[PDB]
Amino acid sequence: LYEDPPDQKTSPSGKPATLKICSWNVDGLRAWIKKKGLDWVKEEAPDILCLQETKCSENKLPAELQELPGLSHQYWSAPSDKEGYSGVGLLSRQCPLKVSYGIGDEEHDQEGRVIVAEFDSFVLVTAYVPNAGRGLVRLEYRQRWDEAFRKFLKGLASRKPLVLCGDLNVAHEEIDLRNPKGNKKNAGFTPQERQGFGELLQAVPLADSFRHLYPNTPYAYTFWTYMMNARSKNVGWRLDYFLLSHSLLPALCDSKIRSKALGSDHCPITLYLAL
């Protein structure tokens, strides 16, 4: 149902891509490593790799990671005492000017969900947004997270062009999932989460890189439940995004969905910028 087109490696002005960013919700760093996740990273060779749902504390990291050639500057965030839950990682070829953790709000900074890495010409944010939960029991909290995260990113974008990547835990529009009808009362497709995502795009402001380039392309998903043969049937959701400041749109080469890369219940996404 979906074939990601070939990589467009030049900006519209003809400038070659100089920066390749890869984002991937790994569904547990060790589970991902066993399913050959690293091998794929080596073939992809990104300049920056953002990982979500590492489920790993910084003191219990797999030794195979620090070894990664060309991704030697590594930063991790996990819940302090809570093992096997949430966790994000940012691995970079080049050293960032500054790395920070969280969104500057105590209530929202306890689950190791955000890493901010400032570079010379942009700020990179990687996030694992909180799921609205089974039966939507964490939806009110999710709406408070949405508001604090929008405010935080608006503050960052005012200082430097912003690239936000990661698992944002929302399929924005009906085109973003296989079954919009059956999912309006489920986490990831509630009107509340959809509205929050629309407000993030308008308030920062940010542009959805994949949708900017491919506005009518259906069946392009980044997550399929491990249950009910969803990935073989392409019953998926586009939960993973690259969101860019409008000033970075002339640097945008391509925004890829690496549908065939195995290793997780999510597939990786890749961004090419001519910075």
Shortest separation between residue 265's beta carbon and Mg ion, angstroms = 6
Judged by CB, which is closer to Mg ion: 193, or 254? Answer: 193
Find the residue with minimal CB distance to Mg ion: 27
Shortest separation between residue 190's beta carbon and Mg ion, angstroms = 19
Phi-psi domain of 232 (left: phi exceeds 0; alpha: psi -120 through 50; beta: other): alpha
* Contact set for Mg ion, span 67-96 (CB under 5 A): none
Site size for Mg ion (CB under 5 A): 2
Question: Does residue 79 have a cis bond before it (omega within 30 degrees)?
Answer: no
For 48, the token pair is 């920056």
Q: Is 167 a catalytic residue?
A: yes
Q: Is 2 a catalytic residue?
A: no
- Pick the stretch among 50-58, 88-96, 155-163, 249-257 that binds Mg ion (CB under 5 A): 50-58
Judged by CB, which is closer to Mg ion: 53, or 146? Answer: 53
| Choice among 27, 146, 167, 254 that is catalytic | 167
Given 4, 27, 111, 254, the residue binding Mg ion (CB under 5 A):
27
Contact status: 167 vs Mg ion (CB under 5 A): no
- Pick the stretch among 47-55, 71-79, 160-168, 197-205 that binds Mg ion (CB under 5 A): 47-55
Binding mask 189-208 for Mg ion (x = CB under 5 A): --------------------
Judged by CB, which is closer to Mg ion: 29, or 71? Answer: 29
Shortest separation between residue 27's beta carbon and Mg ion, angstroms = 4
Shortest separation between residue 128's beta carbon and Mg ion, angstroms = 9
User: Do residues 156 and 116 touch, judged by C-beta distance below 8 A?
Assistant: yes
Judged by CB, which is closer to Mg ion: 28, or 196? Answer: 28
Residue 264: half-sphere exposure toward Cβ, Cα within 13 Å:
30
| Choice among 75, 128, 221, 241 that is catalytic | 128
Q: Which residue has the tokens 């570079």?
A: 119
25 annotated as a binding-site residue: yes
Shortest separation between residue 123's beta carbon and Mg ion, angstroms = 26
266 annotated as a binding-site residue: yes
For 26, the token pair is 């790994």
Binding site residues, Mg ion, CB under 5 A: 27, 53
Known catalytic residues?
A: 128, 167, 266
**Residues marked as binding for Mg(2+)?**
25, 53, 167, 169, 265-266
